[PDB]
Amino acid sequence: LILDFNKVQMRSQQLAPGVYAHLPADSAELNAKGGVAGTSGGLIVGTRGAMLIETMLNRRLFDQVQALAKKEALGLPLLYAVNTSYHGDHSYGNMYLKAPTRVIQSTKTRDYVDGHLADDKAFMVKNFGAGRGVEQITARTGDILVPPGGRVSVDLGGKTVEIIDFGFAQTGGDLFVWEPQSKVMWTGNAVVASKPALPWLLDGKLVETLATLQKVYDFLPPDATIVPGHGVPMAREGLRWHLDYLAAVQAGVKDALARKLSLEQTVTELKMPEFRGYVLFDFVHPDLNVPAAYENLYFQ
Amino acid sequence: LILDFNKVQMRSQQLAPGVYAHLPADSAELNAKGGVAGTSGGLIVGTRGAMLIETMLNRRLFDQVQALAKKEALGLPLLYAVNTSYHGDHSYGNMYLKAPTRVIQSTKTRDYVDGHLADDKAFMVKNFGAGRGVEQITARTGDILVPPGGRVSVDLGGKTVEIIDFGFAQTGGDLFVWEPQSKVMWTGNAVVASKPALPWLLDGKLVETLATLQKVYDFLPPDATIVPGHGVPMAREGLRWHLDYLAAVQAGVKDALARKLSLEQTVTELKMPEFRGYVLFDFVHPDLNVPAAYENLYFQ
Ligand SMILES: [Zn+2]
Ligand SMILES: [Zn+2]
Ligand SMILES: [Zn+2]
């Protein structure tokens, strides 16, 4: 296993008054070395209650972030929990929430969980192992659903949180969480981690993903804090690595398609050694991102 | 990638008059090293025409076994093609069959493909790479469907093939193909390969899988030849490796449960070094099979 979710230990990092990141203890070390880190989350606390960002893969990690949240919110109720995407490491813990907490997710997330949780769980067991808590998961879909391209505001008392679908960034029901007074943005999987981590273009939706992340970059103020899906907080300029990588792949694949190169020749040509460093580079880049983008842009 | 389906090259190996195995060229080498081999298939020919076993992952591999079948069947028509399970490496090639070929598969396979082929493809791209022909696959379900626990016979002229659902061994729609004259049985994934390859208990259904393989063992004559899903032919006694492994896991887990051991100490205790050899042992045994069996037997 590249990442053993039974070995992740969640810690609290205060970002501002009432605003916290939930981070694996080894996440800073792994991101610096280009490793693969566990899921990041967070907590925003207002005057009357709190909002949890991500509910984690399993009961163990859910219990850890719930314990952190009790200290962070000092007894105020958990009013909301947000899933940035359907991916189980961000959403499987929904089942362990109690009243009065309401789940916020995209309508696409709800549709997918409703129809396919069983095969999603099978996939997660295959890649992250059995006995990591996935088998126990039952479906708990959202209460408040953000439609495609939509946004909603949530008032926690004195703090109003923005939950925004900027467009396709990984799944098609990707939500960003924006806390405008501390200027903290949670991206979920849409931003994996700081450099040298790479985006995963699972469906080859390169053009959409680049446009979405450009909109996020243009939206954020220069002093914003970004909490990536699998990394520790970073500054707004940390996004440029991802924007440059996607723009380089887009320019290379478009040029390949204009010259009518085969897929194999395109993969051979777009080695892009200047973007290496990620421990998974030699899989994500030539065995997923480049061929998937080629196949997708073939039809555009 | 543990196995690159773009590098597999299928070969013909005759087992009897009109009975051929379709085996990757390196399957014998890989089985002897405890490696991970590509999908095995086969062909049975009577006076009326031929039956193809497994339609393979992609167009390249489908075309290879179709070319072999044209020589093996000496111009006779391809009357049938059988999918032993829904797994794409056994069935994705269905879409490329032409008239008059009829597909035989389980009703469970048809139901899974109808509801979840898109998810299945996404899983196969993640774990076997993009650009390996999975993206091109469209659904083509069976003409003749075997109900759960059912069986059907097919007369090819001078040869009658038995297609049998012996019970749950991998997916719940697992079909075995039995040719009583040559005494050849195809198992699909229900038997991965000869020793040291291990069963994959993806659902933890240990008792059911052991019972199914025991029934197959009791069914076969002592001079039967088995074509496993991912290996070269085995003798009937080669099943005892898999039967003994599953019985050992069941005894170990049952005794751990009765002593009130946690999942983590059951994994630590069930090292079972006498069943080593598989290059995937350190994953499939402690990270899939032992935990999944523990969780499946937990409430009996
Ligand atoms: Zn994630
Ligand atoms: Zn599905
Ligand atoms: Zn297989």
Query: Rounded to whole angstroms, how far apart are CA atoms A113 and B105?
Result: 28
Closest partner CB to A291 (pick from B130, B263, B290): B130
B279 touches A at CB < 8 Å = no
The contacts of residue A108 (CB under 8 Å, 6+ apart) are: A86, A148, A171, A172, A173
Q: Where are the beta strands (DSSP E) in B17-69?
A: 19-24, 41-45, 50-53
Does B94 carry a binding-site annotation? no
Breaks in chain B after residues (C–N exceeding 2.5 Å): none
The contacts of residue B208 (CB under 8 Å, 6+ apart) are: B167, B168, B169
Chain B nearest C-alpha distance from A224 (Å): 33
User: Nearest chain B Cα to A112, which residue?
Assistant: B119
Size of interface A-B (CB pairs under 8 A): 74
Query: In angstroms, how far is CA A150 from the centroid of its own chain?
Result: 18
Query: Rounded to whole angstroms, how far apart are CA atoms B213 and B68?
Result: 30
Longest distance between any two alpha carbons in chain B, whole Å: 63
Asked if residue A48 lies in contact with residue A157, where contact means CB atoms within 8 angstroms, the answer is yes
Question: Which among A50, A4, A53 is positioned nearest to A233, based on CA atoms?
Answer: A53
- Find where tokens 């099979």 sit: B289
Q: Looking at the DSSP assignment, which residues form a beta bridge with residue B81?
A: B52, B103
Phi and psi dihedrals of B214, rounded to 5? -60, -45
Residue A156: Cβ-neighbour burial (10 angstroms; 0-12, 13-18, 19+): buried
Query: Rounded to whole angstroms, how far apart are CA atoms B215 and B209?
Result: 10
Query: Rounded to whole angstroms, how far apart are CA atoms A126 and A107?
Result: 26
- Copy the structure tokens of residue A26: 């080894």
A2 touches B at CB < 8 Å = no
Buried b (16+ CB within 10 A) or exposed e, A282-299: eebbbbbbbbbbbbbbee
Phi and psi dihedrals of A251, rounded to 5? -65, -35
* CA B219 to each of CA B8, B154, B166, B180, B236: distance values in angstroms, whole numbers, following the listed order: 32, 19, 10, 11, 10
* CA B88 to each of CA A103, B46, B84, B222, B287: distance values in angstroms, whole numbers, following the listed order: 35, 27, 11, 32, 23
To test the contact with chain A by mutation, choose from B5, B60, B263 the residue with the greatest count of A C-beta atoms within 10 A, namely B263
Asked if residue B144 lies in contact with residue B103, where contact means CB atoms within 8 angstroms, the answer is yes
Query: Rounded to whole angstroms, how far apart are CA atoms B295 and B300?
Result: 9
Does B230 carry a binding-site annotation? yes
Query: Rounded to whole angstroms, how far apart are CA atoms B4 and B2?
Result: 7
Does B116 carry a binding-site annotation? yes
Half-sphere exposure of A82 (CA within 13 A, CB side): 31
A125–B288 C-beta distance less than 8 A:
yes
Question: Which among A67, A109, A73, A72 is positioned nearest to A88, based on CA atoms?
Answer: A109
Ligand 2 center–CA A232 separation, angstroms: 32
- For B70, the enclosing helix (H) or strand (E) is helix B59-72
Query: Rounded to whole angstroms, how far apart are CA atoms A193 and A171?
Result: 17
Chain B nearest C-alpha distance from A216 (Å): 27
* CA B162 to each of CA B46, B154, B175: distance values in angstroms, whole numbers, following the listed order: 14, 7, 10
Within 10 A of A25 (CB to CB), how many other CB atoms are there?
12
* CA A101 to each of CA A45, A131, A284: distance values in angstroms, whole numbers, following the listed order: 14, 27, 37
Residue B147 DSSP code: P
The contacts of residue A300 (CB under 8 Å, 6+ apart) are: A207
Within 10 A of B9 (CB to CB), how many other CB atoms are there?
12
Q: Looking at the DSSP assignment, which residues form a beta bridge with residue B267?
A: none
What resolution in angstroms, rounded to 1 decimal? 2.0
Residue B236 DSSP code: G
The contacts of residue A53 (CB under 8 Å, 6+ apart) are: A22, A41, A42, A43, A44, A81, A82, A84, A177, A186, A227
- Which pairing describes strands B160-164 and A102-106: parallel, antiparallel, or unpaired? unpaired
Q: Where are the beta strands (DSSP E) in chain A?
A: 10-16, 19-24, 41-45, 50-53, 78-82, 102-106, 144-146, 151-155, 160-164, 176-179, 184-188, 225-228, 234-235
* CA B294 to each of CA B102, B213, B289: distance values in angstroms, whole numbers, following the listed order: 41, 20, 8
Q: Looking at the DSSP assignment, which residues form a beta bridge with residue B281?
A: none
Query: Rounded to whole angstroms, how far apart are CA atoms A253 and B186?
Result: 43
B130–A292 C-beta distance less than 8 A:
yes
- Copy the structure tokens of residue A294: 């080629």
Query: Rounded to whole angstroms, how far apart are CA atoms A251 and A105?
Result: 33
User: Nearest chain A Cα to B267, which residue?
Assistant: A131
User: Nearest chain A Cα to B200, which residue?
Assistant: A126
Query: Rounded to whole angstroms, how far apart are CA atoms A187 and A183?
Result: 13
Question: Which among B250, B195, B179, B181 is positioned nearest to B228, based on CA atoms?
Answer: B195
Contact residues, chain B, for A2 at CB < 8 Å = none
B116 touches A at CB < 8 Å = yes
Residue type, B29: E
User: Nearest chain B Cα to A264, which residue?
Assistant: B131
A282 touches B at CB < 8 Å = no
Ligand 1 center–CA B187 separation, angstroms: 37
Within 10 A of B67 (CB to CB), how many other CB atoms are there?
12
Query: Rounded to whole angstroms, how far apart are CA atoms B12 and B78?
Result: 16
Does A116 carry a binding-site annotation? yes
Does A89 carry a binding-site annotation? yes
Residue type, A94: N
Looking at all shown ligands, the one closest to residue B87's CA atom is 3
Method by which this entry was solved: X-ray
Q: Where are the beta strands (DSSP E) in chain B?
A: 10-16, 19-24, 41-45, 50-53, 78-82, 102-106, 144-146, 151-155, 160-164, 176-179, 184-188, 225-228, 234-235
The contacts of residue A95 (CB under 8 Å, 6+ apart) are: A137, A138, A139, A140
Long-range contacts: B59-62, Cβ < 8 Å, 24+? B59/B93, B59/B96, B59/B133, B59/B136, B60/B6, B60/B133, B61/B5, B61/B8, B61/B10, B61/B93, B61/B133, B62/B93, B62/B96
Q: Looking at the DSSP assignment, which residues form a beta bridge with residue A164?
A: A151, A176
B263–A125 C-beta distance less than 8 A:
no
Looking at all shown ligands, the one closest to residue B193's CA atom is 3
- Copy the structure tokens of residue B35: 């490696």
- Copy the structure tokens of residue B174: 């697992």
Does A114 carry a binding-site annotation? no
Chain A nearest C-alpha distance from B132 (Å): 9
Query: Rounded to whole angstroms, how far apart are CA atoms A8 and A29?
Result: 13
Closest partner CB to A131 (pick from B120, B122, B291): B291
B135–A287 C-beta distance less than 8 A:
no
Asked if residue B174 lies in contact with residue B106, where contact means CB atoms within 8 angstroms, the answer is yes
A283–B131 C-beta distance less than 8 A:
no
